[PDB]
Every structure is written in structure tokens, then in C-alpha cells.
């Protein structure tokens with residue numbers, strides 16, 4: 001739960017993100033390269049707003065205990081970093097592109113169901129993730145995934161079901177694009193895009209970005225966000241991925257209901273994904 005900084009041996013960057021970075025370190029108290037590998041997060045920017053954002057991420061993660069959520073290990077003490085478990089398989093986005101040929105629909109439905117049970121748990125703790133995407137989901141093993149990257153996560157006050165607040169715009173809900181409103185229902189919208197990513201095996205050529213920019217075309221002077229929003233308000237959606245089982249695509253469309261109230265809950269989605277297998 002307390003890691004001495006002098007015992008955290010740097011290996012490489014996993015990071016690939018703004019404001020903060022995640023490094024692969026070996027917790028090597030014996031100094032012989034035999035200790036367990038850990039994923040260590042730190043904020044590259046200092047100040048009295050980023051440090052508040054960093055303490056909040058620590059507090060949120062420390063209090064989360066689920067098989068489908070990256071495990072908190074502790075914090076570091078030195079002459080402050082967040083210490084979590086390291087998943088050598090890495091993000092689901094890259095895993096799906098490397099192992100495409102052996103991952104069938106039942107396997108993708110198993111990952112979908114696991115992500116869903118993780119989000120149900122997040123909702124129960126009043127946590128809005130705000131950054132649900134395949135790049136933020138980690139592969140624990142062949143048949144097990146976990147939700148990671150809690151850098152944008154916010155706790156919903158007891159008397160509110162939403163929150164009013166830089167990621168690719170193709171994962172946001174219309175209400176987040178228009179009024180910066182975030183809730184468990186906008187995490188459901190994002191989940192719909194995760195199902196799309198999974199059933200495309202995160203192929204870059206039919207990625208939410210490639211497919212939406214292709215559909216948006218090119219507006220005369222209208223900004224791209226406004227364009228995406230006009231496309232979404234019009235009822236236009238990402239097309240069924242190639243060879244996608246029809247029922248999966250119907251589930252995506254429900255996650256993509258225009259109004260937050262009409263979107264299914266994670267609790268409602270779970271049995272539906274389990275039934276499909």
C-alpha cells in the first residue's frame with residue numbers, strides 16, 4: 001500500500017495520454033530485477049487543480065474493488081505516484097488487432113458482458129467514467145478484461161444523477177457534445193461505441209473516427225463537433241460493423257438512444273449480453 005520511490009525501477013512508458021503518464025516500473029526492493037512489475041501513474045503538470053484531480057483519481061480507485069476494474073496497489077513515498085497492477089497484454093484495442101483470427105463473436109460478447117458488469121459496479125459507486133473506449137480497457141487474460149484510466153472519473157453527488165464539466169469526440173453522447181453534461185447514461189452511449197470497436201476488432205479503417213468523418217463529409221465553415229452533432233440529431237449512427245450479429249447491432253442502437261432517459265441501464269444490458277453468450 002506504500003511503495004518507496006527508490007525501489008521503483010523505471011523500465012518504459014505505457015502513458016500515451018495528456019496531463020499524466022503511466023510508466024512500467026518494477027517494484028524491486030531487493031534491487032536485483034526480480035520484483036513484481038507495476039503500472040505507476042503521475043501527473044506531469046503540477047499546481048492546485050491538477051493535484052486535486054490526481055488525489056480524486058487515487059481516492060476513486062482505492063475504494064473500487066471489482067474483478068472488472070484495474071486493481072489499486074497503493075501510492076508512492078519518495079524524497080507522490082499512484083501504484084496499480086500491470087497487465088502485460090495491454091489495451092483491448094491493440095489486443096483485438098493482434099489476435100483478430102482467434103477471437104470469435106462469443107469471445108467478444110464475453111468481453112462485452114465483463115465491461116458491462118464493471119460499469120454496473122461503477123454506477124453503483126456513483127462514478128461516471130467519462131472515458132470508456134477500447135484503449136482504456138485492459139486484457140487480464142484470454143477470457144478476462146478490466147476497465148482502466150480513471151483520470152476523468154467523477155463522483156456523482158447524492159442528490160444529482162448528472163455532472164456538468166479533450167478525448168476523440170466520437171465516443172461522447174449528444175448531451176456531452178452540446179452542453180458538457182456527463183452521467184451514467186452518457187457512459188452507456190460510450191459503451192455502445194465500445195461494442196462497435198469490439199465488433200470491428202478496432203480496425204482503423206472502419207474505426208468510429210474514420211467511419212464518422214467519412215459520414216460527416218466536409219462542412220463549408222461549420223466546425224466538426226457541430227457537424228457530428230447535426231449528424232447524430234438527424235438520427236444517423238455508425239453502420240453495423242461487417243459480419244456483426246444483428247442483435248449486437250440492435251443493442252448498440254439502444255445505447256445510442258437520442259435522449260439519456262431512453263438508453264438502457266448497465267443492469268438491463270448485462271443479462272441481454274449474457275443471453276447472446
Ligand SMILES: C[C@@H](O)[C@@H](CO)Nc1c(C(N)=O)cnn2cc(-c3ccccc3)cc12
Nearest residue numbers: 014015022039084085086087090136148149
Ligand atoms: C489504460 C491506460 O491507462 C494504460 C496506460 O497507457 N494503463 C495500463 C495500466 C494501468 N493500471 O493503468 C496497467 N497495465 N497496462 C499495461 C499496458 C500496456 C500498454 C502497451 C503494451 C503492453 C502493455 C498499459 C497499462
